[PDB]
Amino acid sequence: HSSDDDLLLPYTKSHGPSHSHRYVRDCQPVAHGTVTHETQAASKHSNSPVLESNIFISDITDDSGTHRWVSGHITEVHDPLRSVSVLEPGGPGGCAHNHRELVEVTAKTRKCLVAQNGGYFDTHTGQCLGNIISDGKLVRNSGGIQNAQFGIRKDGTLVFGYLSEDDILDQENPFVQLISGVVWLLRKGEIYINESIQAECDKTQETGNFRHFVDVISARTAVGHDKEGKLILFHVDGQTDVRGMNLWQVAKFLKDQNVMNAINLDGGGSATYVLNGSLASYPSDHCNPSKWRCPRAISTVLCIHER
Amino acid sequence: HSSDDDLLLPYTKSHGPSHSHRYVRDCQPVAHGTVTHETQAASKHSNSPVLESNIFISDITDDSGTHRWVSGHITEVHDPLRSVSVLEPGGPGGCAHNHRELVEVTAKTRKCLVAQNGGYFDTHTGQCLGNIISDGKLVRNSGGIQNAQFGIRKDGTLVFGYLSEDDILDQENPFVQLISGVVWLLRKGEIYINESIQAECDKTQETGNFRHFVDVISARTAVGHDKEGKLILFHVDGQTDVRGMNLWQVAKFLKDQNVMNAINLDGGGSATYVLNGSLASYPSDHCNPSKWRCPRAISTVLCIHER
Numbered sequence: 001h002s003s004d005d006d007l008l009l010p011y012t013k014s015h016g017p018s019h020s021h022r023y024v025r026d027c028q029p030v031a032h033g034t035v036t037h038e039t040q041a042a043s044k045h046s047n048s049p050v051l052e053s054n055i056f057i058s059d060i061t062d063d064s065g066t067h068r069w070v071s072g073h074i075t076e077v078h079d080p081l082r083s084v085s086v087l088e089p090g091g092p093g094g095c096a097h098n099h100r101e102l103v104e105v106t107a108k109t110r111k112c113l114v115a116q117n118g119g120y121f122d123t124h125t126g127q128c129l130g131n132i133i134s135d136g137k138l139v140r141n142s143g144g145i146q147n148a149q150f151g152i153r154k155d156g157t158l159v160f161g162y163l164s165e166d167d168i169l170d171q172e173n174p175f176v177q178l179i180s181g182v183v184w185l186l187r188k189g190e191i192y193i194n195e196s197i198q199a200e201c202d203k204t205q206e207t208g209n210f211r212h213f214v215d216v217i218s219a220r221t222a223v224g225h226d227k228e229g230k231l232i233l234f235h236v237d238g239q240t241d242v243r244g245m246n247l248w249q250v251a252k253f254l255k256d257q258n259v260m261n262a263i264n265l266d267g268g269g270s271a272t273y274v275l276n277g278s279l280a281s282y283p284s285d286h287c288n289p290s291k292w293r294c295p296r297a298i299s300t301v302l303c304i305h306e307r
Numbered sequence: 308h309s310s311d312d313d314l315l316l317p318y319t320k321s322h323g324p325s326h327s328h329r330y331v332r333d334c335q336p337v338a339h340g341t342v343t344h345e346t347q348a349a350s351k352h353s354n355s356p357v358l359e360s361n362i363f364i365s366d367i368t369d370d371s372g373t374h375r376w377v378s379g380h381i382t383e384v385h386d387p388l389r390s391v392s393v394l395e396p397g398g399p400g401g402c403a404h405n406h407r408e409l410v411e412v413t414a415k416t417r418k419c420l421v422a423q424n425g426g427y428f429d430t431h432t433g434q435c436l437g438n439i440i441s442d443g444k445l446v447r448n449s450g451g452i453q454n455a456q457f458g459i460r461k462d463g464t465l466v467f468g469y470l471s472e473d474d475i476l477d478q479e480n481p482f483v484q485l486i487s488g489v490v491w492l493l494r495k496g497e498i499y500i501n502e503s504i505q506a507e508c509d510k511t512q513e514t515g516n517f518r519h520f521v522d523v524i525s526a527r528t529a530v531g532h533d534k535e536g537k538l539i540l541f542h543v544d545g546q547t548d549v550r551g552m553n554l555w556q557v558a559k560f561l562k563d564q565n566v567m568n569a570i571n572l573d574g575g576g577s578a579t580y581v582l583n584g585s586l587a588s589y590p591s592d593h594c595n596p597s598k599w600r601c602p603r604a605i606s607t608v609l610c611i612h613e614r
């Protein structure tokens with residue numbers, strides 16, 4: 001069991017901004033009009049593998065000129081409507097019980113080919129956070145908390161960005177999967193982090209810690225899509241302020257991989273990549289009894305499985 | 308398929324020294340008398356798990372004062388006689404056909420809980436190298452080539468060091484597993500690398516490349532045992548002259564983990580750690596078609612399985 005000692009928290013108080021979807025609409029740049037999310041038809045390649053999972057080891061140079069090697073995975077999903085599931089921790093109903101569980105354990109319940117940790121959660125109580133829809137079922141309605149969202153609609157539409165409560169409750173072309181992160185990294189192929197800071201953080205003293213959350217290097221995970229509508233999962237190992245990538249670096253890395261929209265999921269010691277049910281990354285938390293590293297018990301999971 | 312582009316080769320000519328076991332005996336330090344290998348009764352904990360597999364991420368400082376993070380795995384095996392197998396590539400008979408195969412593919416044929424790449428092989432032809440005994444069966448008799456050896460005898464004796472041909476053909480308490488590496492890292496708890504250079508390399512121009520093989524940082528793997536007779540498997544990710552550890556650093560790392568005898572197995576792009584049949588490390592070779600990394604098709608495999 002992990003010690004939970006690499007905590008990378010975007011908020012010091014309540015999770016998410018306090019302002020409404022309408023506030024987000026009214027503050028976004030004029031280029032985006034009145035619509036606060038993007039849509040893309042998912043790819044639907046029946047004559048292709050379910051996914052391709054690739055390992056990268058790359059040299060990143062930060063602003064100060066310092067070089068660092070980072071390691072991680074990029075996963076490309078060819079038929080997201082059929083193969084992608086947002087899973088509650090442990091099993092259906094896990095969120096109602098404030099249950100936390102390793103990615104690998106949750107992943108095995110659905111024989112996920114690739115699984116990563118998913119959304120944010122209360123690291124003291126285990127409470128789930130954000131909006132959650134799992135295989136067509138509404139698991140958690142945040143009441144319109146304005147954090148970055150990723151969803152899939154019944155007709156295969158991929159959705160990225162900010163959603164109202166009315167949006168997620170829509171019964172026309174309803175969401176079949178939905179999860180929330182913190183920070184919209186890329187919008188229409190451009191870095192959207194400064195816009196995210198304004199949308200997803202209260203304009204208070206909170207912004208200092210939130211900008212640190214953005215600027216510090218750590219382990220990170222993200223989900224996005226490319227121009228063909230393939231879903232892209234991203235993971236990079238790290239440790240807060242010691243190894244890994246900050247969100248500017250993640251967004252640039254994904255942009256160069258031709259990702260068009262992408263959101264940041266949970267990171268730090270939460271970041272986990274699981275291949276066919278086996279841990280296949282280097283987590284940053286220490287195990288309770290040693291100098292060894294241990295995967296963290298987390299909340300929702302993003303699972304890629306056979307159609 | 309991997310491009311085989313991180314090659315870490317100890318020899319520029321034929322594999323191994325040209326001199327006999329008697330030569331090795333006659334040149335070793337007086338402290339070791341006339342016996343050129345060590346023995347340890349294997350642990351036999353029936354009331355324990357098969358293995359414990361631990362992840363490390365550690366800061367290494369080299370001679371020049373330069374700091375680097377390295378990542379890898381330490382696996383502890385509680386009943387080695389029952390749980391450890393040396394596997395030919397692909398399946399029994401693979402060496403006879405100069406067959407190469409991914410660790411993960413070979414590992415799945417025996418449902419290995421943990422598997423690593425094993426011995427050296429000819430990177431042009433695929434020919435197996437060293438001595439090989441797999442589950443009691445003599446696969447390859449090198450004819451007494453004096454490289455570092457790891458074996459398990461029928462009565463559970465762990466054997467590390469230099470062996471004659473007569474030693475490996477012994478029908479009293481015969482070897483049930485046997486594999487060869489290059490360099491005996493630790494002997495009786497002390498670093499034995501300089502002694503290994505003398506034993507395992509011809510005293511010719513070859514020593515320059517061999518000392519580079521020892522001194523350069525790269526991905527590395529090793530096998531050893533602790534004072535209780537538990538088998539210890541070691542893996543560290545890396546890339547020759549860019550990331551990872553040199554053999555001095557590996558020996559010191561293992562010595563601090565209370566490893567008493569240990570040999571160096573194949574490294575560079577060969578180094579692979581596989582958990583329950585899934586790749587669970589970051590290989591250094593590039594894939595044939597990309598900037599992505601790919602596991603290498605290698606030769607023998609060290610497999611830990613259920614008794």
Ligand SMILES: *[C@@H]1O[C@H](CO[C@@H]2O[C@@H](C)[C@@H](O)[C@@H](O)[C@@H]2O)[C@@H](O[C@@H]2O[C@H](CO)[C@@H](O[C@@H]3O[C@H](CO)[C@@H](O)[C@H](O[C@H]4O[C@H](CO)[C@@H](O)[C@H](O)[C@@H]4O)[C@@H]3O)[C@H](O)[C@H]2NC(C)=O)[C@H](O)[C@H]1NC(C)=O
Binds near residue numbers: 194
């Ligand atoms: C992403 O956004 C950050 C934050 O922007 C800042 O906060 C927002 C909440 C909002 O209020 C913005 O209006 C505001 O800029 C950007 O980081 C900021 O970048 C600006 C511009 O580079 C910096 O402004 C400078 O602040 C100095 C005091 O700390 C001040 O002395 C500077 O003025 C002097 O020097 C400059 C030349 O360097 C010159 O232009 C002036 O005329 C004067 O000589 C200047 O005002 C902020 O300090 C930065 N704030 C933080 C917290 O870093 C960031 O650049 C942006 N990134 C991208 C990629 O868009």
Ligand SMILES: *[C@@H]1O[C@H](CO[C@@H]2O[C@@H](C)[C@@H](O)[C@@H](O)[C@@H]2O)[C@@H](O[C@@H]2O[C@H](CO)[C@@H](O[C@@H]3O[C@H](CO)[C@@H](O)[C@H](O[C@H]4O[C@H](CO)[C@@H](O)[C@H](O)[C@@H]4O)[C@@H]3O)[C@H](O)[C@H]2NC(C)=O)[C@H](O)[C@H]1NC(C)=O
Binds near residue numbers: 501
């Ligand atoms: C592991 O082994 C290496 C190799 O040892 C060398 O090669 C072997 C095959 C064998 O022949 C040995 O006899 C031989 O030493 C060790 O690395 C060597 O270390 C020695 C001693 O430190 C070095 O000797 C020095 O060589 C210089 C020329 O390059 C020479 O100028 C030096 O003499 C001057 O300076 C020293 C003080 O630094 C002083 O003692 C002298 O009196 C004189 O002022 C000195 O002779 C070798 O160059 C090293 N060789 C290589 C290839 O690095 C290594 O130390 C050892 N490691 C461990 C942990 O045991």
